[PDB]
Amino acid sequence: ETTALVCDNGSGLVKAGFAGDDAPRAVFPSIVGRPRHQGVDSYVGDEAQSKRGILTLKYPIEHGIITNWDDMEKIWHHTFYNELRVAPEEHPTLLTEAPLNPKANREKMTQIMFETFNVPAMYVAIQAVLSLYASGRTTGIVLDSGDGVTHNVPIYEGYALPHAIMRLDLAGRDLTDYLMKILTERGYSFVTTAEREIVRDIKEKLCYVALDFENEMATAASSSSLEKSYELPDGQVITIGNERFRCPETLFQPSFIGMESAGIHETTYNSIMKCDIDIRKDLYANNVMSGGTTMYPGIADRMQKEITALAPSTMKIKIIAPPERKYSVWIGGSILASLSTFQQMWITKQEYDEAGPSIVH
């Protein structure tokens, strides 16, 4: 066939699909399972998830960086052959990487696409910058927060400013774990692997960011107005009250999970302050949120409040939170891969043959 592919590999989820679609058609867990003793060769994604229990399950991307290459090769095979139902040798493939991904790492991605999958052409794009593009901008500061890592990435005239990038190893998995902890403290039992998945769903369905933590805690202590009932698959019902906003509060106050790090408002400010003073105005007016961990209701308003408190009193602050932002990286990749002016930028199989891996730089 013909259509270019966009594969946005994350710590928790693979988002894959065809350039020109408006969302990824294949979204599945970035997990590879190989047989346990009871099992007695490899499974990926939803099937791995459902056959977990007779598999040893591994995440090949850790905090946004590919670390297990053999399992990553399995992910990509499943992506092409099982999910997209394509022959990879027939489709140019755009892949994504984390900010500050080592050069040796982008090179191994490239070596594998060509030497294992025989793709005709490929490209590796930085995730946060693709999210900025998806919002129609070439200058701004992205907060990209997923399952495994959070970054602040200031971007000027199309390209990230690497000296000002901030990485925080606090993201959605840590929030899921903390929700599990605080639900356990309330008296619920969430221990099994099935139960951890339930907690992730609760997080995604019911959590939100309070505008002011203390005020919200006081409302929750004196009223039922913030309570929600959540129905488990087996029919059991639990009440979630202040856990709804205590969970994502950790993004702003990482001390809730024992981390000494600055919160996401502070890392955003600190990143802007590492940039030339003459571009800061434009960064402040173009803070784009990306990634599943930015999906909490209330997060934009809270960011607005917190950045306003840190920034000069006359600064225009604007937080942009696209509704599609679980998929902003992928959408930016799709938009980019379609541009007429991008077609020259693909690395072709023939160019790889002459130069070797470092051509991707």
Ligand SMILES: C/C=C/C(=O)C[C@H]1CC[C@H](C)[C@H](CC(=O)NC[C@H](O)[C@H](C)C(=O)NCCC[C@H]2O[C@@]3(CCC[C@@H](CC[C@H](C)/C=C(\C)[C@H](C)O)O3)CC[C@@H]2C)O1
């Ligand atoms: C000159 C230096 C280049 C570098 O890559 C240096 C690196 C060194 C390391 C440093 C950390 C930084 C990294 C970086 O930002 N890389 C680029 C990044 O991967 C993005 C996704 C990309 O590949 N982007 C490629 C964009 C290619 C497009 O570039 C343009 C110019 C720049 C802005 C870009 C905007 C494309 C989007 C899809 C369109 C939008 C937002 C319209 C305006 O709505 O178009 C013209 C068309 C062209 C096809 O920059």
Ligand SMILES: Nc1ncnc2c1ncn2[C@@H]1O[C@H](COP(=O)(O)OP(=O)(O)OP(=O)(O)O)[C@@H](O)[C@H]1O
């Ligand atoms: N509505 C929501 N509310 C809160 N969290 C959400 C919501 N939807 C998804 N998430 C969380 O977003 C995360 C997945 O987001 P995303 O796909 O951007 O991450 P990733 O790319 O796999 O990881 P990373 O970018 O950290 O490598 C998960 O932790 C998931 O639970």
Ligand SMILES: [Ca+2]
């Ligand atoms: Ca991601």
Ligand SMILES: [Ca+2]
């Ligand atoms: Ca307070």
Ligand SMILES: [Ca+2]
């Ligand atoms: Ca703290």
Ligand SMILES: [Ca+2]
């Ligand atoms: Ca200057």
